[PDB]
Amino acid sequence: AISQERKNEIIKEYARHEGDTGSPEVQIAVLTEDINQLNEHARTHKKDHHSYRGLMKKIGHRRNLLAYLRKTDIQRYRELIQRLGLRR
Amino acid sequence: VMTDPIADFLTRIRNANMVKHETLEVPASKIKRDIAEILKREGFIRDVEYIEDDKQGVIRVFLKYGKNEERVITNLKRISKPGLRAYVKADEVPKVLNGLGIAIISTSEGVITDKEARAKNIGGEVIAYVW
Amino acid sequence: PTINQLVRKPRKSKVEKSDSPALNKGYNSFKKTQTNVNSPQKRGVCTRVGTMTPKKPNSALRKYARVR
Amino acid sequence: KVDYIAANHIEYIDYKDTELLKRFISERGKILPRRVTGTGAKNQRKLTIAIKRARIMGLLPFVSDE
Amino acid sequence: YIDPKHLELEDRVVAINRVTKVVKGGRRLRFAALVVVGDKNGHVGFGTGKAQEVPEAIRKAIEDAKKNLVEVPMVGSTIPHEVIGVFGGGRILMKPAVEGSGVAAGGPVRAVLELAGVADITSKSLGSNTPINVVRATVEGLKQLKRAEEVAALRGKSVEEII
Amino acid sequence: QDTKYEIMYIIRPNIDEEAKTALVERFDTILKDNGAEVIESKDWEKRRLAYEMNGFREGIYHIVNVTSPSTAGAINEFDRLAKINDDIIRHMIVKVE
RNA sequence: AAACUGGGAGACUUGAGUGCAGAAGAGGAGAGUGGAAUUCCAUGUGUAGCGGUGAAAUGCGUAGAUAUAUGGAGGAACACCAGUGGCGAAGGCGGCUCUCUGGUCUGUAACUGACGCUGAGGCUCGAAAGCGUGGGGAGCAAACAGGAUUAGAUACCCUGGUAGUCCACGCCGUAAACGAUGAGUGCUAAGUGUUGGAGGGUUUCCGCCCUUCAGUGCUGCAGCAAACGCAUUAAGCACUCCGCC
């Protein structure tokens, strides 16, 4: 839902080298922006059951990528989840 | 998703054999190359050539047919499966089709035929029956 | 089934039952009635006598009794 | 039978050029099928939206007998 | 190919069947016959025919039975290896046996097996027991028997290299 | 960026030629006060209609051309004021591309 | 002992995702708006029927019906387009404009580097009928009343008619919820339609020929089936995981 300038704005600060659109940092940060905006839209339109499906699938994708990042490098994982403000 | 590449190889061979045409190609692997050599030594395949570019593969097999276009391999079966593995002891090595067929066994000293294993007196994982 | 389904929950067969079930009995003397003691016969006292008519398509008056 | 919207290379329909629209409606005002006019699948969708737009803005009759 | 019917052949009845067809009024009845045919040397055929009486039926069946015949290889009164013959709901397993053990086989399959000169073999029917389909499945399973010579010829090997 | 619209309304036929200019300028203003960059505003033609709307069988067509960011509360203001007027009869706002 | 399965240190790009450039659509939520028709109301003209059935009757009508002309009020459904067409995980979705929003397809080759598949218990959604609170109520219509028919008719047929069918918010959790065909992945003849793309040629090719992706139908081979039949959209040949007899 975020514009195409917000997206590049936030993938230019979780990159690692240049040209770095992959790298699970980028993907979970952009997914976090999406999930926040969709939560807003749901609070407003709470009987849009057909958009809630997409919300839930984004949440599944993010949790999966987090599991991957943890199982391979705990330092990057901790530093991220501090920087991004989650892990309740 | 693919979970058994050895079974996929075997079913390519059987599928292309039953429709009776004379070539076949698979993505390569160290175990499939082994059993392609074992299939070539006994007389089921005619040839095998190894191309390789930028991913694993590939392996090309050249089937073989009789004098009146009848088939030299008649079937082919995968024994050990991911989900139920089959290990055999040196006195349990099987004899497929009363010696008229072969079994393929992986041991501590190669992937070999079932004759070569009951001549060495060892056992291991059982890959396939080809009769 | 897959063999994983079988390992999670095994196979169970059917249970057979006699057709002479009043011949595995137990006393009613001191406490209660015990079921281990398969007999080939049992005895009793006949509390009535008489006759009855068969099913379809037979025809007779077949002699019988009731026994405790 | 050639798609007249493909005769020219016409990009937009504009629901205002009632001169172009007026050849896809019958002599009573009803929309003609994709057969009797030989147009494509998506140009037909655009044309239908066009004349439905026209009827509302009073450029075109819904029914025409009186 | 055609094994041509020019031998010494001992037939055998395997089944008969009263079969009707209801028409205007009452009922018609024929007799269907199932017959095997062989010489107890390795050539066996089956065939069936129907007529209005039992002798005429069995005759037409032997007529039919002789038109087909199979080669049935063996290696000293015992089948070369183990086969499973399947034809429409009849499944029949056959194993090589020990010298002088006999034939342990059911009704329909033992007729087929004995009229080809088989002496020592074990069988089992894991299927239905309708005589026609049992006979057809048994013959379907003999056709899979492979000689030891032919295998060595098809591959690039000799015998005593694969046995 | 922005989004482009095309507003098309139908004025009453029997008005004079100064209330007409007053109306046009009025709605240009009240478009612009909410951040709607108007970029064209014309008269089109005098036509008769295919059916009578209120009691009228003629009317004067006027079209405007306007861009704005998609969230600005401008183009709804036009609606809310146009359906309570007395000289306009219909309007159709439409995204243009 | 060291091939395979498991563990540890690495490396790779085909699976899976991301970026960049494009395409189609009754996908969903909110707010306004249009015309055709049915009902009722008001007014003018207007004379004895109208309505209904296999035939009749009940009903409405000389307090001027039906018809006919002009004006108002309200509700619900959206003719033609419209198609073995499109979209959705399913239930489902068709007048028009705007706002908010989910997914799919195609090309490319910047990027990450196996991040994948399936999923008991758990949660979410789920036609119609039904239940609760408060609105709305034109047409249709369980229950019910009256007229017929029959041996009888607590039915079918005719004249009426209440809940309900509609909106907001809660509950219910079931259907022949069906393709009576769980999901993922690879492999195995051909011919012919249509929906959305991408390449090459001739080139007004933008209308034609060829190739190639993803949907959706028809015919048909090997193979399968107890027959019916199925057949690159498998019910064929094979591996993984769940549900069930």
**Is E98 within 8 Å of chain B by CB?**
no
Q: How far is C5 from chain B (nearest CA, A)?
A: 11
Among chain B residues, the shortest Cα distance to E96 is held by B98
Bridge partners of residue C62, in order along the sequence: C52
- Say if the Cβ atoms of F90 and D58 lie within 8 Å: yes
What is the resolution in angstroms?
2.9
How distant, in Å, are the alpha carbons of B73, B104, C8 from that of B13? 10, 16, 35
- Say if the Cβ atoms of B99 and E163 lie within 8 Å: yes
Task: Give CA angle at E53 (E49, E56), nearest 5°.
Answer: 50
Report the distance separating Cα E105 and Cα B32, nearest Å. 43
**Is B68 within 8 Å of chain E by CB?**
no
- Say if the Cβ atoms of D64 and F8 lie within 8 Å: no
Burial bucket for residue E93 (CB in 10 Å: 0-12, 13-18, 19+): middle
Among A58, A79, A60, residue whose Cα is nearest residue A2 = A58
Nucleotides of G under 7 A from a protein CB: 1-5, 13-15, 17-21, 24-30, 32-36, 79-83, 85, 88-90, 95-103, 110-112, 114-117, 124-126, 169, 184-189, 194-197, 206-207, 222-223, 226-227, 236-245
Q: Which chains are within 8 Å of A by 3+ CB pairs?
A: none
Joined together, the tokens standing for residue F28 give 């240009």
Claim to verify: residue B40 and residue B79 sit in the same structural domain = no
**Cβ atoms E16, E31 nearer than 8 A:** yes
- The Å distance, CA of A53 to C1' of G104, is 15
**Cβ atoms C53, C61 nearer than 8 A:** yes
Q: How far is C4 from chain B (nearest CA, A)?
A: 8
- Say if the Cβ atoms of F50 and D57 lie within 8 Å: no
Report the helix count and the strand count for chain F, using DSSP H and E: 2, 5
Joined together, the tokens standing for residue B22 give 């004379």
Number of domains comprising chain F? 1
Range of the domain at B120: 74-131
What DSSP string describes E39-84? Answer: -SSS-EEEEEEEESSHHHHHHHHHHHHHT--B----SSSS-SS-EE
Query: Which chain D positions have a beta carbon within 8 Å of F47's beta carbon?
Result: 59
Bridge partners of residue B81, in order along the sequence: B84
Protein fold of E10-67: Double Stranded RNA Binding Domain (3.30.160)
Check the CA dihedral D2-D8-D9-D10 and report its sign: negative
DSSP F94: -
Claim to verify: residue B104 and residue B122 sit in the same structural domain = yes
Range of the domain at F77: 3-96
Q: What is the dihedral of CA D54, D60, D62, D66, to 10 degrees?
A: 170
**Cβ atoms B127, B111 nearer than 8 A:** yes
Count of C-beta atoms within a 10 Å radius of residue F58: 13
**Cβ atoms D39, D4 nearer than 8 A:** yes
Claim to verify: residue B120 and residue B68 sit in the same structural domain = no
State the SS3 of A6-70.
HHHHHHCCCCCCCCCCCCHHHHHHHHHHHHHHHHHHHHHCCCCHHHHHHHHHHHHHHHHHHHHHH
Q: Identify the CATH number of the domain in which residue F20 sits.
A: 3.30.70.60
Element (H, E) at F28: helix F19-32
Report the helix count and the strand count for chain E, using DSSP H and E: 4, 7
Claim to verify: residue B32 and residue B94 sit in the same structural domain = no
Number of domains comprising chain B? 2
Q: How far is E155 from chain B (nearest CA, A)?
A: 5
Report the distance separating Cα D51 and Cα D60, nearest Å. 8
- Say if the Cβ atoms of B100 and E163 lie within 8 Å: yes
- The Å distance, CA of B80 to C1' of G23, is 48
**Cβ atoms E132, B81 nearer than 8 A:** no
Report the distance separating Cα D56 and Cα E15, nearest Å. 85
